[PDB]
Amino acid sequence: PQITLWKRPLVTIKIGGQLKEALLDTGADDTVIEEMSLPGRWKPKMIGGIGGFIKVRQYDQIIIEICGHKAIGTVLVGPTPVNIIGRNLLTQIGCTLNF
Amino acid sequence: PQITLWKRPLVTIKIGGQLKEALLDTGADDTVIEEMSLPGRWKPKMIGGIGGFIKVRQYDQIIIEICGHKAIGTVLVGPTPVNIIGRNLLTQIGCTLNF
Ligand SMILES: C[C@H]1Cc2cc(F)ccc2S(=O)(=O)N(C[C@@H](O)[C@H](Cc2ccccc2)NC(=O)OC(C)(C)C)C1
């Protein structure tokens, strides 16, 4: 598909057996999701942006589905104000910027 | 061009006759640049990011070139960690997400 930028590029994702709305975010290195349970080991991480840093839990090798496209990668879980799909997963679905 | 997301989508912009590096950011509603001098009057704006809020100065109808493409629009100036080109200008340059 081709997604315009007149409004926020929000999509439905499937993660940890749950459906969530998330922002396709080329400005995010990492994928960051609001509080939820994920299986497996995790380690703490600090991530920064506008307004400073938040502490998150880093889960590796998590399967996500974004627009019928399956991918695997690291997912950070924490007090993000919006669910964000970052570049680590956008690359896997073959997402590019075009102009 | 077609920009992949294996690396940060950093481009050169030109504003106030000076070249700067900025991030093409689909997750940003607005364009936010680090402290610099811009002409005219500014208005106050509050922007919310990952770690909270920053107060910025809103300048309207500013001439800015993004990856060689000419745009004229709103530029926010404040303590952002990186220069960000948001959807207000990505739409002016005809940028879309594609997969
Ligand atoms: C430079 C980036 C740093 C960063 C790096 C990551 F690995 C993950 C998230 C983030 S972020 O801090 O989240 N962000 C991505 C932005 O796309 C962000 C997404 C977002 C939107 C709404 C609330 C919280 C985060 N928009 C953003 O900061 O927008 C403004 C404040 C620039 C307008 C900026």
Curated annotation (Swiss-Prot), chains A, B:
Chain's role: Aspartyl protease that mediates proteolytic cleavages of Gag and Gag-Pol polyproteins during or shortly after the release of the virion from the plasma membrane. Cleavages take place as an ordered, step-wise cascade to yield mature proteins. This process is called maturation. Displays maximal activity during the budding process just prior to particle release from the cell. Also cleaves Nef and Vif, probably concomitantly with viral structural proteins on maturation of virus particles. Hydrolyzes host EIF4GI and PABP1 in order to shut off the capped cellular mRNA translation.
Protein name: Protease
Subunit structure: Homodimer, whose active site consists of two apposed aspartic acid residues.
Active site residues according to the UniProt entry: 25 (for protease activity)
Peptidase A2 domain: residues covered: 20-89
Segments of this protein annotated with the region Dimerization of protease: 1-5, 49-55, 88-99
